[PDB]
Amino acid sequence: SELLVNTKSGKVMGTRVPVLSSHISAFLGIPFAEPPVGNMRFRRPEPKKPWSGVWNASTYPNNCQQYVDEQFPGFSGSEMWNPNREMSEDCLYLNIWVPSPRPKSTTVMVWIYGGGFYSGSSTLDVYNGKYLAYTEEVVLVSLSYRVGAFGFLALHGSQEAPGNVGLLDQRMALQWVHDNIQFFGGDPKTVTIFGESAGGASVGMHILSPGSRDLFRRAILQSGSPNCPWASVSVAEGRRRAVELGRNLNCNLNSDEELIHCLREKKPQELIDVEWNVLPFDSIFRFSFVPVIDGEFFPTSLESMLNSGNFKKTQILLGVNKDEGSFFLLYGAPGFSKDSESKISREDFMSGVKLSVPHANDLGLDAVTLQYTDWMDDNNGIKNRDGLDDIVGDHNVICPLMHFVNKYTKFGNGTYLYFFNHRASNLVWPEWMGVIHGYEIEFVFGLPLVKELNYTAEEEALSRRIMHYWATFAKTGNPNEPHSQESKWPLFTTKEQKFIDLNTEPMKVHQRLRVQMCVFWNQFLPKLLNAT
Amino acid sequence: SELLVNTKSGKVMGTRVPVLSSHISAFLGIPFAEPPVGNMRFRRPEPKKPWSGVWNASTYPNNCQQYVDEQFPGFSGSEMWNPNREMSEDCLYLNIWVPSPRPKSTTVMVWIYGGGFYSGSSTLDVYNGKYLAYTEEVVLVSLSYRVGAFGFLALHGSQEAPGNVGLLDQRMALQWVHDNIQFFGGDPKTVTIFGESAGGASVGMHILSPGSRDLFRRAILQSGSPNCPWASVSVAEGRRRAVELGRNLNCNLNSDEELIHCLREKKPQELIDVEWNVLPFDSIFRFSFVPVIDGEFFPTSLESMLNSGNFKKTQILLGVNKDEGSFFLLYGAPGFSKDSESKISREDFMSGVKLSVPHANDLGLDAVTLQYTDWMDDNNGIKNRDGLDDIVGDHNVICPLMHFVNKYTKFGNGTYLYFFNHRASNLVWPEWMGVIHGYEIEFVFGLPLVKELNYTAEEEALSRRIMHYWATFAKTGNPNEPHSQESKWPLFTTKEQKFIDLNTEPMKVHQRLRVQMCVFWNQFLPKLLNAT
């Protein structure tokens, strides 16, 4: 039977799912690790013990325990990101969509979800792998991993909570794919890892980490980079936040062992309820429990690894959206609301800057404010709002990614850079938010091909082109069809620094993506902060 | 006789001069001080002892001893600024052009020449007062003052060389005008002082200095401001440069008295030959012997005076030229030449920045470079050259003047701001230099009305309009004719910050002259340099 697969861990039974007037096979909720529960909370994951009999892989698995966004109850804009399955610490599962008939040795794509390392689910409507699996004839895997304190509580030196365990979850699922995807018709030597935001930082982290490199062939990073200022902390900062979490829950703080024991007795929601209390600054776009620069998963600082070529050398495809910052300002910054135009006063602008660059002294804050203020028109509410949007997107997403592409490209085997700037016609978020963080994902997963979802014909065409870029890149290391008649997405090179826009217009090629602003964020401001 | 005037110092005899098919009276080379020679070198000036008989005031006087520009021998572009009379330390004279017939009580304008406080002459072709005196019916005075070490050698605490003596020369001539201009038909209660570059800084310095304020009614500042970074030094820096000048001439340095005695024995050219050796940095747009912030002529720092309203409150008219920096780059910066287009390499750009902001640490230098570099096109030779031109003009002229207008306007009685951006059609300097420092002067003095000088008809019209703005402002405190049909030059106000362009096109009104760049120079960079 097409729906039955014997793997090295045991037999699994899938389910036939309809897709665009046809069908494919789905194997949902396959375990890749032992449930990380009880005395295993905070521990490195352990491989799943093989099972006798047939694993029922017909239904989506539990999502990992996480903070749930209740800022706009009933609003689909925000609720589409929330867990749509019961939450459990027993959450280490993966999902596979397989073309029908079962292929023999086809290109594999493995999705790693974002969510700031504090949230995310493999089971979201917008991550449904069937359209891409069906349309491009790939085997589509989505994995899961522990988030929040569960995935990233870091007490370096301890072996009960060393940090990075959520990244090791991701690695274990990649190992499982390596070992077993052949039985689903996947080629384990042609696995592309891809992810958005924290999932894109994750992808870059597996490129960097010696223990992950051999498990995949190539990589796609959407709106996320391993060097993002929000994506990792030092071992000292991770420790401080773990102790502070303990302090919030009235834990004995005399030793790691006393602290960890206390944290292990708490119900999952008890950790989540105080998770946001441990941040060192009043800030936006900062999350509590994130990867830790530990000397193990990352052997040295991210910057020295990037500089020395200490990373996997392969092809990468990556890029950003036009308005990365708007989502985070809406949630944290004064003056921003969902149902107004959010014109921002000079005062709210000033306050926004401080929230956005929490680590800056006053000189640093002045430098940012000057760089992003039109002094001929400093009270223009639209300009101040859009300026903040750029500050947040440039600092947190675009300029770290640009630093990564420039460093990577000197040692890698081929870089393709995009700038996604089409706003979906059916977005329910306000217009001021523009082309929002995360709203290229639906195009990558081919949702615009579903007529009931009410996209335009031009948006279906853009989705088809994006899916085919991603899958062709996955197959060959080049998003372009050989000997094709369409416009060519050129290689990003050190010298010419080319990229393309992704939108509904005819492809345009540009150079030096946001270079003026990224020189400020990547060269000048760090030098300013170090000297003062 | 029209050409004979009894003054409080004695009788003077002038000369009838032709002007535009008519005639007026000129009284040239009237002494206002005792020759500052011998044991009086470096001393405050003394009033001229009255003379018996008739002073022959038919010919231009000697110019003060100064460095002579020999960078382009035979080239009129540079030679038109050099002394056109014999140089002497006996140089404290003034020149008066008087309408014919002699007026009874008319508006007076007193010109103070620029030249970096190290040079300048009252007798230049381009300072000939007859066109303005004749055309606008004003009494036009040009004074002189000691420059270089002669005017500005400063050993604070000593009474033999206290500093600022060149400013006191200017003050003595203003006192003489106060006391005596009535006899030439001038109204001593309606004297406008006006000057360019160091002469404009001078004008602002008399606005500030308690001992000068009562001697004039109102003021015009062209391309110069008292707070310019090149226009004054501290008492400690003035002392250091005086000692260093002594060191260059093998002087005994054991005391002020030993130093001054030695400097007094030297021939004038001996001081001039080593004058440029005393500058503390490799720099452009910095001059050796300049006004000193002494606690006497200036009772406190220029900035605290501006902040507290400690200055004469009256009407001012002032502004700048589009390309203030080009002249100084040509003379000092690598990569700039008179007979090429001077396209500037990235290297020469970097070097230019250091010359332009000599007082900056590396962070400061990075801040400037970032502010003025187009990072999408950083190797564009034209952009780098024009960028440097703006750096030099903004730092040294435009932004200090903008800081002055903003501070002054909060306490003053009416401000009119211009931006002169017409390049003379007959300029012999290369085109890359644009609308050069100093090339509005010829328009203010009405040279375009002289047909043999080969200006266009439109340039004669611009000259006439400028002369009439200046003279009407001098007469009434407003450059606009009451109940006139032409476009109105609006008041510069704290709130709206209006100015006009001066050129051959119909008047346009703008706001916030170079505000983006001036916020950088006036607010951010000083804060950066203080913190680092």
Ligand SMILES: *[C@@H]1O[C@H](CO[C@@H]2O[C@@H](C)[C@@H](O)[C@@H](O)[C@@H]2O)[C@@H](O)[C@H](O)[C@H]1NC(C)=O
């Ligand atoms: C496989 O599971 C299918 C769907 O099952 C449902 O959800 C899971 C999580 C369980 O709670 C189960 O009791 C629910 O019915 C079933 O339709 C199907 O019978 C199962 N196939 C088997 C057991 O061979």
Ligand SMILES: *[C@@H]1O[C@H](CO)[C@@H](O)[C@H](O)[C@H]1NC(C)=O
């Ligand atoms: C990638 O590697 C191959 C084989 O080593 C090489 O021939 C090719 O030029 C490389 N391509 C790029 C874009 O670096």
Ligand SMILES: *[C@@H]1O[C@H](CO)[C@@H](O)[C@H](O)[C@H]1NC(C)=O
């Ligand atoms: C100047 O001073 C006069 C008299 O004190 C006053 O009436 C007038 O408003 C002032 N003008 C400006 C522009 O400040």
Ligand SMILES: CN1C=CC=CC1=CNO
């Ligand atoms: C809320 N959320 C979670 C994961 C990825 C994106 C995201 C987005 N909003 O744009």
Ligand SMILES: CN1C=CC=CC1=CNO
């Ligand atoms: C050389 N020189 C002297 C005084 C004023 C201006 C000047 C100018 N060049 O523009």
